[PDB]
Design a protein around this ligand. Structure first.
Ligand SMILES: Cc1cc2nc3c(=O)[nH]c(=O)nc-3n(C[C@H](O)[C@H](O)[C@H](O)COP(=O)(O)O)c2cc1C
Ligand code: SF4
Ligand code: SF4
Ligand code: SF4
Ligand code: SF4
Ligand code: FES
Ligand code: FES
Ligand SMILES: [Zn+2]
Lengths: 24, 263, 13, 106, 83, 80, 87, 426, 210
């Protein structure tokens, strides 16, 4: 001629309705 | 009455006067390889990939077009009607850009199959290829139209099934490009059907661009709930999230078409 | 003339 | 060479893998190009047939020369895109020489 | 974080695996590497793109650098070509 | 447009849970009879398989494309 | 194209009739495949009789059983298709 | 044996020399028995052409009488029509340019004589748009005729009604095609239709229609006047009648002479026109019917004569009978190469075999002229040629294949040498 | 074949048939069968070309409007035919016939001469925007092979300097005797009229009986 760590790289697939923080 | 007798490689079926040669083969059960012929779209004869050989006849006939006459035996697997397909497939492929691993109509191609079953083992087009210029037909259909086999089923659907009458052929020769002359988006409901109806993957769906590949998609047959026509649809799911919804045929409700909303 | 064929058409009409 | 990863997510490497080892899911990168969001070769599932080497059109997935990758934990053997791309960068010089020597044969 | 951006939030469990360990991510992120690639100027209306090296490249495709408005990009290399 | 996959009847078991796997994000299934789709040539034979194996069945009649009349001459009609 | 030797296709066909005549009972659909291979098909009751004739007949000695297998055609009323290959 | 008499010759006004206008036409006596002919009956007119046994004067050869006979069937409530194609895109077809420009009237009465034969309500003449001046001449002639009352309702003092119109072509060779002339007349893109719905059955605007080469329409009144027999005698067997012959390229006096059909090919350059430039031995090849027909090399040149039966025996077509001659001073490989360039710039692209096939032969032909292509490729162009020949929707793909087939058939050694020449200099 | 709107060539360029032009239009439709406006688009498109050579996207839209057809329908017709120009055309717009018949009889010869005289490449307008050269295909009139149609000038049988002579005539003055500058008349054997040198028989000559 002269420790790994496996993980899912894809992101979330189903998002979630976040409660309205405005109280009613 | 009204039952001419026509022979399909001998099965001698009897058919209504006015049925096309391609239609005669269908009732026996044979399939003429076809492009540019869709059952609910007008016959155009553009591809001529369906040339068959009626017996005792000098030239081969266009299946989708010739009204079958009395006692003409169709020879669908003759030594001639195969050179009439081995030589057409030579042409469609010659100007084709080989980006099959880009074309998301990878396993959903009616042009690789027919090549892979009725066409030729190798190519002789040592000459150069052509390229067209990708344009914008809208936000739903991605027209990578260098793929187009000028089969004019879009121009038909866009005029006959939907009344858009916008898409049209422009020019002559080997640079006939079937795209809107001025860049006006193809905005209409029934728009996404063009994807399903273009056998080539020239124009395909932009949201479902590259999320999947058809062999993987598990296909569950269900019902359209977005609108009250209740159109039949097939939900294609991979590893548990829906990847596409495409139409499945119901003669009475949605006959092979679904709305832009419900796909 | 550029329009002579076309003008000849009107008379036939 | 430029630095763009070869894989274009045609996903037939997944189709021809005999063991179901390769899992690929993709989406159009902002560039508009086609790339794999997740490429996971489960090496414990893989039986090192070398068909993936065969199948790839861009030849993005290759059978690299190294055989010494024994690992203390089972999870390390499962490989995501980042480990394989990192494996690719480390051994690219020899992989290129090896493919250079054998491509005429293929 | 990574090419795709896979990341774990504070509340996110499934982030412990890295505790006292390291994650596999990439420098030389490709997303920017071709963007760093100069636009291949050409004379002809259409140009090829073997990917470089023929058999050792990508299935050849011909790109239409016909409009300066857009530099054709071979769907395989992401190389922009400047008419 | 090929119709060679619309020929034989198939009976398919009902779909079940496909939860995401925490370590790698691969789909995971707890239902053994999921990927199994048996192919039967005729409706009568498939119904028989369900009865002797004791699985519940809900047969769907084949729906084949209706004959459609086509003729190249017809669209050339300016009248209509 | 495989190197078919019609010489075989005929001789094996002729034996297929021979067996069909010798055991008109228990034997139906005797056919020589396009692969120069014979495949007498017998009623299940003819298992003992047809084999024995082939194991012990001067004009057809079929001493060793290469394999016994059962394809399963679920559609077929009789699900299994026991196949005995003899040499 | 040709050598038709001037008196027998059909278009006396050929080469002008006589007023193309009506008063010249009256001295010609073109409108002499028109009332009588129409009076006789439509059936009498078709009897005259059937007796004449005239063949199509356009590139395709078919009995003229049988073609007209087809739409003589009873009207189904749609007006029957006449379409005269004055387009002649084929190279060497300056012929029809003559009748239109020099003798417009002959065609005008050809139209009404022909019209009652098919019972056409009206006739549309599609002169190629290129010829703007030519158009100027015919409608001046058409205007004269109506002013006279020769055409129009109660035309020629008879029960029958006819109206004649001129339509602008727009520089397309394919417009010439029978199903495509119609579509241009219809106003859609000039793309041929399939023959199943035949032109008579579904013509223009869905009304029965018939299409004739302008020469074919023009001779019908004179043939009825002279009778089928007179006309029938000049021809040979199925072949019959005088057809204008245009000789262009490598001849001393290129000209269009309406000399008799069945002329020895050696005779028409040698006796009329101009002997082949450079001598009759300086003839690398002859294109008998124009670009569409295969060229024939000198060996068979004089032996054979110009009639459609003799040519089909020779593997070539009488076609438009346009004789294009190539001396030994021409690169045929490049000559035929531009005809394939002539067809890539012109085929409609509606059908897959012509669209890609003609472009494919153009690319191979250009390489052949350079000699870059290897010898084995020659035969492939042949195989590419017959794929196009029998698979095309119209005849133009038929036409593109024949010149390629001719070059390989008789000049295969020359192309191999061009192959060899480039390989040697490396 | 794509109209990317440009300030010059785009509908901002308003188009409308001159009162005189519109007249010509009506006549066209009637010539065509009743209820068939569509047949008239190729002739109506031609008069838009007669009005202005450029015929921009605006002009085609008007044609479709006047003819009440799908606009695309007009766009398809304009693109298919070479007669229509979708780009500005030189005042003279000479076109040189280069099919094999003309080439065999030297058509190419003429080209080189014209390129030099116009001092410009083949295919574009002179800077003077006075001339435009294009290599068009068979224009008919082959017997006279050397040939160059300039707006129907159809000059034929032209030796190189002839054209130069013609071009000069065009460059200074107008109407340069359009036609075959050769002595021969229309198409005639250069030798003479072998076909018919006798006088033409008169009316009712040898008219067959019946
Ligand atoms: C590509 C093509 C171009 C043609 N051009 C012409 C033409 O310019 N003039 C013509 O008379 N016939 C032309 N024809 C032949 C017509 O299709 C048709 O056969 C003919 O015009 C009928 O006239 P006839 O029956 O009187 O001969 C052409 C055919 C093809 C395939
Ligand atoms: S269409 Fe897409 S998939 Fe079908 S062949 Fe052309 S490229 Fe390959
Ligand atoms: S787009 Fe699809 S459908 Fe429209 S022509 Fe090209 S291929 Fe045929
Ligand atoms: S690895 Fe090769 S084959 Fe598998 S997807 Fe990426 S490119 Fe296609
Ligand atoms: S052959 Fe096919 S393409 Fe060529 S002209 Fe006739 S139809 Fe149009
Ligand atoms: S399928 Fe035969 S014409 Fe298109
Ligand atoms: S080719 Fe030039 S006019 Fe016929
Ligand atoms: Zn590339």
């Amino acid at each position: 001629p002269t420790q790994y760590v496996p993980y899912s790289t894809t992101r979330k697939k189903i998002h979630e309705w976040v409660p309205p923080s405005t109280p009613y | 009455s009204n039952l001419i007798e026509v022979f399909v490689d001998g099965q001698s079926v009897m058919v209504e006067p006015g049925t096309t040669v391609l239609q005669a083969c269908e009732k026996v059960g044979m399939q003429i390889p076809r492009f540019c012929y869709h059952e609910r779209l007008s016959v155009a004869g553009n591809c001529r990939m369906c040339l068959v050989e009626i017996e005792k006849a000098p030239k081969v006939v266009a299946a989708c077009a010739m009204p079958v006459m009395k006692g003409w035996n169709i020879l669908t697997n003759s030594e001639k009607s195969k050179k009439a397909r081995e030589g057409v497939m030579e042409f469609l492929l010659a100007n084709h850009p080989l980006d099959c691993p880009i074309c998301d109509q990878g396993g959903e191609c009616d042009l690789q199959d027919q090549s892979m079953m009725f066409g030729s083992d190798r190519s002789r087009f040592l000459e150069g290829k052509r390229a067209v210029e990708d344009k914008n037909i809208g936000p739903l259909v991605k027209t990578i139209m260098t793929r187009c086999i000028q089969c004019t089923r879009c121009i038909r659907f866009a005029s006959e099934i939907a009344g858009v009458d916008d898409l049209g052929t422009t020019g002559r020769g080997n640079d006939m490009q079937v795209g809107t002359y001025i860049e006006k988006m193809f905005m209409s409901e029934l728009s996404g059907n063009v994807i399903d109806i273009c056998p080539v993957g020239a124009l395909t769906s932009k949201p479902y661009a590259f999320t999947a590949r058809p062999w993987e998609t598990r296909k569950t047959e269900s019902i359209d709930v977005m609108d009250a026509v209740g159109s039949n649809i097939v939900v294609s799911t991979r590893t548990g999230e829906v990847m596409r919804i495409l139409p499945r045929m119901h003669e009475d409700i949605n006959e092979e078409w679904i709305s832009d909303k419900t796909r | 003339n550029t329009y002579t064929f076309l003008d000849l058409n009107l008379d036939l009409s | 060479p430029s630095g763009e990863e070869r894989c274009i997510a045609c996903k037939l490497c997944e189709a021809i893998c005999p063991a179901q080892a390769i899992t690929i899911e993709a989406e159009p990168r902002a560039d508009g190009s086609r790339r794999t969001t997740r490429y996971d070769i489960d090496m414990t599932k893989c039986i090192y047939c070398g068909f993936c080497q065969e199948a790839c059109p861009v030849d993005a997935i290759v059978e690299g020369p190294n055989f010494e990758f024994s690992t203390e934990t089972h999870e390390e053997l499962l490989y995501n895109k980042e480990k394989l791309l990192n494996n690719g960068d480390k051994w690219e010089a020899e992989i290129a020489a090896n493919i250079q020597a054998d491509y005429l044969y293929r | 974080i990574t090419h795709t951006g896979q990341v774990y939030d504070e509340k996110d469990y499934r982030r412990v695996r890295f505790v006292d360990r390291q994650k596999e991510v990439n420098e030389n992120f490709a997303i920017d590497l071709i963007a760093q690639q100069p636009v291949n100027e050409v004379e002809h209306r259409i140009i090829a793109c073997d990917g470089g090296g023929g058999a050792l490249g990508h299935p050849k495709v011909y790109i239409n650098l016909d409009k300066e408005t857009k530099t054709g990009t071979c769907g395989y290399c992401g190389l922009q070509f400047k008419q | 447009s090929g119709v060679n996959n619309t020929k034989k009847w198939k009976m398919e078991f009902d779909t079940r849970e496909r939860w995401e796997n925490p370590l790698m994000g691969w789909a995971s299934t707890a239902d053994p009879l999921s990927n199994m789709v048996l192919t039967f040539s005729a409706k009568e034979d498939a119904i028989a398989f369900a009865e002797k194996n004791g699985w519940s069945y809900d047969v769907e009649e084949k729906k084949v494309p209706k004959p459609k009349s086509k003729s190249y001459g017809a669209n050339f009609s300016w009248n209509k | 194209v495989r190197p078919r030797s019609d010489v075989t296709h005929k001789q094996l066909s002729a034996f297929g009739e021979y067996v069909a005549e010798i055991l008109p009972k228990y034997v139906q659909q005797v056919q020589v495949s396009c692969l120069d291979e014979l495949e007498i098909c017998i009623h299940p009751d003819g298992v003992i009789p047809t084999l024995t004739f082939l194991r012990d007949h001067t004009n057809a000695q079929f001493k060793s059983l290469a394999d016994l297998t059962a394809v399963d055609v679920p559609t077929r009323q009789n699900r299994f298709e026991i196949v005995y290959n003899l040499l | 044996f040709g050598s038709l008499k001037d008196e027998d010759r059909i278009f006396t006004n050929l080469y002008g020399r006589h007023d193309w206008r009506l008063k010249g036409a009256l001295r010609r006596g073109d409108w002499y028995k028109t009332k009588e002919i129409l009076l006789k009956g439509p059936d009498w007119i078709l009897g005259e052409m059937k007796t004449s046994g005239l063949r199509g004067r356009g590139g395709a050869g078919f009995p003229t009488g049988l073609k007209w006979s087809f739409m003589n069937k009873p009207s189904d409530g749609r007006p029957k029509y006449l379409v005269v194609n004055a387009d002649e895109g084929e190279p060497g077809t300056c012929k029809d340019r003559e009748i239109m420009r020099h003798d417009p009237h002959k065609l005008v009465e050809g139209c009404l004589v022909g019209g009652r034969a098919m019972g056409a309500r009206a006739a549309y003449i599609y002169i190629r748009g290129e010829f703007y001046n030519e158009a100027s001449n015919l409608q001046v002639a058409i205007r004269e005729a109506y002013e006279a009352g020769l055409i129009g309702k109660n035309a020629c003092g008879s029960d029958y009604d006819f109206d004649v119109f001129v339509v602008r072509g727009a520089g397309a060779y394919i417009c010439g095609e029978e199903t495509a002339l119609i579509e241009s007349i219809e106003g859609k893109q000039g793309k041929p239709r399939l023959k199943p719905p035949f032109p008579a059955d579904v013509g223009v605007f869905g009304c029965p229609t018939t299409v004739a080469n302008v020469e074919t329409v023009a001779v019908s009144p004179t043939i009825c006047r002279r009778g089928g027999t007179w006309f029938a005698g000049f021809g040979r067997e199925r072949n019959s009648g005088t057809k204008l012959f245009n000789i262009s390229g490598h001849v001393n006096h290129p000209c269009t002479v309406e000399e008799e059909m069945s002329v020895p090919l050696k005779e028409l350059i040698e006796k009329h026109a101009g002997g082949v430039t450079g001598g009759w031995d300086n003839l690398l090849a002859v294109i008998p019917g124009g670009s569409s027909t295969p060229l024939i090399p000198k060996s068979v040149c004089e032996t054979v004569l110009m009639d459609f039966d003799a040519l089909v025996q020779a593997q070539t077509g009488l076609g438009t009978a346009a004789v294009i001659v190539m001396d030994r001073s021409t690169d045929i490989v490049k000559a035929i190469a531009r005809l394939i360039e002539f067809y890539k710039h012109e085929s409609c692209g509606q059908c897959t075999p012509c669209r890609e096939g003609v472009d494919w032969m153009n690319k191979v032909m250009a390489r052949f002229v350079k000699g870059d292509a290897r010898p084995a490729e020659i035969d492939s162009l042949w195989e590419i040629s017959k794929q196009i020949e029998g698979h095309t929707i119209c005849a133009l793909g038929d036409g593109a294949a024949w010149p390629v087939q001719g070059l390989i058939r008789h000049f295969r050694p020359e192309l191999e040498d061009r192959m060899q020449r480039f390989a040697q200099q490396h | 074949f794509v109209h990317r709107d440009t300030p010059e060539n785009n509908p901002d360029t308003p188009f409308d048939f001159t009162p005189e032009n519109y007249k010509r239009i009506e006549a066209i439709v009637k010539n065509y069968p009743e209820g068939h406006q569509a047949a008239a688009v190729l002739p109506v498109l031609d008069l838009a070309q007669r009005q202005n050579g450029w015929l921009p996207i605006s002009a085609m839209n008007k044609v479709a409007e006047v003819l009440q057809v799908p606009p695309m329908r007009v766009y398809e017709v304009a693109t298919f035919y070479t007669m229509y120009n979708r780009k500005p055309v030189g005042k003279y717009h000479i076109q040189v016939c280069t099919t094999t018949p003309c080439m065999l009889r030297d058509s190419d010869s003429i080209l080189e001469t014209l390129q030099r005289k116009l001092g410009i490449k083949v295919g574009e307008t002179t800077p003077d925007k006075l001339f435009t050269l294009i290599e068009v295909e068979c224009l008919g009139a082959c017997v006279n092979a050397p040939m160059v149609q300039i707006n129907d000038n159809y000059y034929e049988d032209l030796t190189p300097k002839d054209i130069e002579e013609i071009i000069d005539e065009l460059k200074a003055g107008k109407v340069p005797k359009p036609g075959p500058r050769s002595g021969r008349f229309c198409c005639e054997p250069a030798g003479g009229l072998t076909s018919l040198t006798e006088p033409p028989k008169g009316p009712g000559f040898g008219v067959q009986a019946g």
